[PDB]
Amino acid sequence: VTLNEIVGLEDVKEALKEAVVYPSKRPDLFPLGWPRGILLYGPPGCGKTMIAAAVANELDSEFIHVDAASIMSKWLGEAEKNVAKIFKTARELSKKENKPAIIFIDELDALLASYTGGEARVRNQFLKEMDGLADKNEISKVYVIGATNKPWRLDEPFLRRFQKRIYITLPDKAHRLELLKHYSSKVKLDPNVNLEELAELTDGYTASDIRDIVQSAHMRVVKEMFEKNLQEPRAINMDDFREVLKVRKPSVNQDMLKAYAAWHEKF
Ligand SMILES: Nc1ncnc2c1ncn2[C@@H]1O[C@H](COP(=O)(O)OP(=O)(O)O)[C@@H](O)[C@H]1O
């Protein structure tokens, strides 16, 4: 919900401010126009969804969450209906409240995965809608924020509608620390717990991963409590984490990270 709740992504936040907020707030200062389709790409659970909602919140604009997998329906014309409805709703909401409307589409790549054209005809209908967003005469202000963990699955026709493209990265050593401080903050830690060390040990783990680690480590003492009929749980100690790390790997493999940085190298 807010930007300030999002750990890293200081430069992402700025790119979305610059692509969406400042134009919405001051169109008169953008006499050379600006893109309305913004691609967030990266590994899973690193804040593509959060960052999109956080902007919608920053604007207090309407926010419309769609899963691309859900709109691709195996009947001709239901999918078309879906894609038309989305943008229509967006435009109406924008026009009614006189402020922007943000469509967040996650699993975007799923628009290129086959079901029954037909799926091409839906795709092209979507892209037509995209192309329609900047049209000068429309009083509604609609932005599409598209998200995918497999940007490489997007073809050229589809990529050209997304002119702004931000890489949302794994959390770095410093940021993982903030993440750990943040998640761990609501549970009882042993003094022997060294968050700096754990940040080091969590190289390659996604923000959601980190959350799941903390939960899982909290689970060990809670499990103990109940098993032993105690009133509160034992504190979470440094071992507790090591144990859970022994079995939990990064959600993203060394190849994927290259896939991403390669893809990033273009486009
Ligand atoms: N940068 C971040 N700061 C704080 N929490 C994060 C961050 N990235 C991910 N998370 C956590 O992981 C969950 C999934 O994040 P999400 O925004 O869905 O990213 P993605 O679209 O990449 O899956 C969030 O609900 C949040 O708890």
Author numbering: 97 to 212, 216 to 366
Recite the paper's sentences.
Vps4, a member of the type-I or meiotic clade of AAA family of proteins (ATPase associated with various activities)11 disassembles ESCRT-III polymers from membranes, which might be coupled to the membrane fission reaction itself. Proteins homologous to Vps4 and ESCRT-III are also present in the Crenarchaeota phylum of archaea where they catalyse final steps in cell division, virus budding and vesicle release.
To probe the conformation on nucleotide binding, hexameric MsVps4ΔMIT and a shorter MsVps4 construct lacking the linker region (MsVps4ΔL-MIT, residues 88–369) were crystallized in the presence of ADP and Mg2+. Both constructs crystallized with P65 helical symmetry with similar H interfaces as observed in the hexamer structure and a V interface close the to A–B interface. The base is stacked between the small and large ATPase domain in a pocket composed of residues Met146, Leu278 and Ala306. Comparison of the nucleotide-free apo structure present in the ring structure showed that ADP binding induced a 23° rotation of the small ATPase domain compared with the large one. Our crystal structures reveal that the β′-strand at the N terminus is ordered in the ADP-bound conformation and disordered in the nucleotide-free conformation, suggesting that this conformational flexibility might be important for MIT domain orientation.
